[PDB]
Structure 1
Amino acid sequence: VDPRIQGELEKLNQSTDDINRRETELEDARQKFRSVLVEATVKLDELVKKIGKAVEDSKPYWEARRVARQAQLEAQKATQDFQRATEVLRAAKETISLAEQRLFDSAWQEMLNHATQRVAEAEQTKTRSELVHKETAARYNAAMGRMRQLEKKLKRAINKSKPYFELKAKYYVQLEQLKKTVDDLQAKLTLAKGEYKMALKNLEMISDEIHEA
């Protein structure tokens, strides 16, 4: 049973070598992340040190823009849902129209009865959908108005702050992806450790096997 434990321990040796490789890889990754983030720090600081008033005055505009976008998505959803509701009502009424024109009669009766049982909830959903639609559109356009009057008084600031924020954005998504890489890589490393450990457990199992033999 010697070649068995031999091959086993060789395989786990390859495994722990792999572990070492992934460890060094991870360390290198994080060390790469750090320099990038501090670069982002100093560039952000220097660009703020360029013109601070423009940026600080620009922020409310971006705030209003975000709010307006949220209201946009909400209003869009409300509109779509209302459309679906309208379609549902259309079909539900078309059914009863045909059924009434007909006046296998039992099947027709059951069908029109189920339909005319569903049209009530249909109408309720219609009302809900349309009122929600109106509200959403209202808040929507209100936010658009405030954003407009904000854009009227911030033409000089936001243009200056635009490159700062786009740079900040690029560095943000970059460091984000980097951190992602670090995370999943470390996870895979842990899994590898699990594998190596499992090979060791096999070693213990065989060690238990032989002395019993």
Structure 2
Amino acid sequence: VDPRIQGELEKLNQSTDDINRRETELEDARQKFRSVLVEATVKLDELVKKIGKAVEDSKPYWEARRVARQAQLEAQKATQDFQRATEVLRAAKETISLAEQRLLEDDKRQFDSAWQEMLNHATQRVMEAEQTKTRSELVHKETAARYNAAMGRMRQLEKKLKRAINKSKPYFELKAKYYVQLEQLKKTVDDLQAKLTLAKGEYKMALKNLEMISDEIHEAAAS
């Protein structure tokens, strides 16, 4: 079948054009990343020569400042898992206390039967709550000191070698301005790269049809 093959032919040649285009789109994306990279580093290395020793002496603090953020997020879990534990205890205390008012009387006729299932659950609820409470109230304590020690150490390392930290300030800033630029560029290249392989992938997929179509037209030929 001649009409069967010519249609498939047009498709593969359109793919090769699209791929050839997208390859060149990456080339401009690749070399521009190469260019920005080397351009970035001649600036940062120049800063090193300006102020070298201070930056080295500054790194004990910045690593400690990193720990400051990490020690904090330990507390963020501790305080909130404790806040939840206190609320669960209160809501269960409420469920019990409201039941307790109707529990002293036992005079409720139609109400007492309804109440007791609620009470028995709540009394079994507090069994679980107080334990997660005591666990969380201690976790609240563990992270807290580390958070105080981290600040205390940061503060101690703040007050010590301030001079070192002052001179290193511009270095980490151009480091940060380039860092956020590169992270954005990598994603542009990486996502284009993925889009390449899907195109080169669907191109290989289109050729497999030809093998099958040649195989398929072969059966018709035998007749």
Q: Above 0.5 in TM-score?
A: yes
User: How many Å apart are 1:35 and its aligned residue?
Assistant: 1.7
Contact 1:33 1:178 in 2 (8 A): yes
Please report how far the alpha carbon of residue 76 of structure 1 lies from its aligned counterpart in structure 2 after TM superposition: 2.0
Which runs of 5 or more structure 2 residues have no equivalent in the other structure?
103-110
Q: What displacement does 1:157 show?
A: 2.1
Superposition deviation, residue 120 in structure 1 = 1.6
Superposition deviation, residue 105 in structure 1: 3.6
Identity of aligned residues (%): 99
CA-to-aligned-CA distance 1:136-159 (integer Å, 9 cap, x gap): 111101111111121112322222
Cα distance in structure 2, aligned partners of 1:120 and 1:173: 50
CA deviation profile, 1:160-209 (whole Å, cap 9, x unmatched): 21111011112122222222222221121111111112221222222222
Name whichever of 38-47 and 122-131 sits farther off: 38-47
Is 1:156 paired with 2:167? no
**TM-score when normalising by structure 2:** 0.89
Distance 2:59 2:27 in 1: 37
CA contact (8 A) 1:9 1:199 kept: no
Instruction: Report which of the two structures shows the higher radius of gyration computed on alpha carbons.
Output: 2
Distance in 2 separating the partners of 1:6 and 1:107: 79
CA gap 1:12/1:107 in 2 versus in 1, 3 angstroms? farther
Write the distance in 2 (CA, Å) between the matches of 1:200 and 1:115.
Answer: 68
Root-mean-square deviation (Å): 1.6
Where structure 1 has 5 or more consecutive residues not aligned to the other structure, the ranges are: none
Please report how far the alpha carbon of residue 211 of structure 1 lies from its aligned counterpart in structure 2 after TM superposition: 2.4
Alpha-carbon shift at residue 107 of structure 1 (Å): 3.9
Q: 1:68-120: per-residue Cα shift (whole Å, max 9, x none)?
A: 11111111221111111111100011111111212x54442222112211212
Matching residue of 2:106:
none
Q: Is the 8 A contact 1:99 1:108 kept in 2?
A: yes
SS in 2 for 1:26: helix
Is the aligned partner of 1:85 residue 2:92? no
SS at match of 2:163: coil
TM-score, normalised by the number of residues in structure 1: 0.93
Aligned pair count reads 212
Deviation at 1:31, TM superposition (A): 1.4
User: What is the Cα deviation at residue 27 of structure 1?
Assistant: 2.3
- Which range moves more in the overlay, 194-203 or 46-55? 194-203
Of 1-10 and 46-55, the range deviating more from structure 2: 1-10
Measured after TM superposition, the shift of residue 4 of structure 1 is 2.7
In terms of mean alpha carbon deviation, does 196-205 or 137-146 score higher? 196-205
Q: Partners in 2 of 1:198 and 1:66 — Cα distance?
A: 49
Which moved further from structure 2: 105-114 or 117-126? 105-114
* Contact 1:75–1:137 (8 Å) recurs in 2: yes
